Amino acid sequence: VNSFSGYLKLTDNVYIKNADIVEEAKKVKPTVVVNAANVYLKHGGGVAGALNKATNNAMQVESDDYIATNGPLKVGGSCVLSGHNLAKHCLHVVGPNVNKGEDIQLLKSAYENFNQHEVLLAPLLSAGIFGADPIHSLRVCVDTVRTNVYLAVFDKNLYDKLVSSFL
Ligand SMILES: C[C@]1(Nc2ncnc3[nH]c4cc(F)ccc4c23)C[C@@H](O)C1
Ligand SMILES: [Cl-]
Numbered sequence: 001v002n003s004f005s006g007y008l009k010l011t012d013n014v015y016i017k018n019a020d021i022v023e024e025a026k027k028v029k030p031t032v033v034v035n036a037a038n039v040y041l042k043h044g045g046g047v048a049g050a051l052n053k054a055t056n057n058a059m060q061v062e063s064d065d066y067i068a069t070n071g072p073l074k075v076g077g078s079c080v081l082s083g084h085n086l087a088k089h090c091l092h093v094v095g096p097n098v099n100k101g102e103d104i105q106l107l108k109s110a111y112e113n114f115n116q117h118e119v120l121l122a123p124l125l126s127a128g129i130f131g132a133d134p135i136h137s138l139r140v141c142v143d144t145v146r147t148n149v150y151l152a153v154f155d156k157n158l159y160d161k162l163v164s165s166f167l
Pocket of ligand 2: 045046047127128129
């Protein structure tokens with residue numbers, strides 16, 4: 001039993017809700033919140049901009065130190081950093097950005113990072129400003145993640161379409 005509330009159950013391990021991931025993280029304080037990161041951990045917009053704003057820019061300060069030490073992530077890769085006031089940890093995961101021409105096949109590799117964590121609150125990778133089809137992202141999530149994932153979908157219209165079209 002966990003503290004996530006109001007989710008629709010899609011499969012044995014995947015759950016979905018129309019919610020603002022920022023507000024959901026603040027309420028649940030999950031062990032792991034996933035960020036829709038880029039390789040530079042520049043949290044300017046989309047989910048990343050919203051999460052970083054909610055940390056009062058502390059996420060960005062920590063991220064800049066991480067990059068100065070380690071260099072950029074790989075597309076499809078991840079790193080674990082602090083969750084600040086939102087979660088114990090933040091798993092920064094880089095899905096391919098279609099608006100940059102990146103290989104959509106890397107979306108499966110991106111979701112594989114979730115399997116290193118027993119339970120996660122997450123957005124759909126590569127959705128939103130990353131330009132991929134969210135219906136496809138949900139399919140890859142369900143077919144790749146084996147740990148327990150609670151997906152927050154900000155847009156109500158998109159949420160209803162994801163549910164109604166789910167096979
Ligand atoms: C992939 C999508 N991104 C989000 N998913 C979950 N929670 C979110 N909160 C946000 C706050 C913001 F200021 C900007 C984007 C998001 C966002 C779902 C769809 O709407 C684009
Ligand atoms: Cl977005």
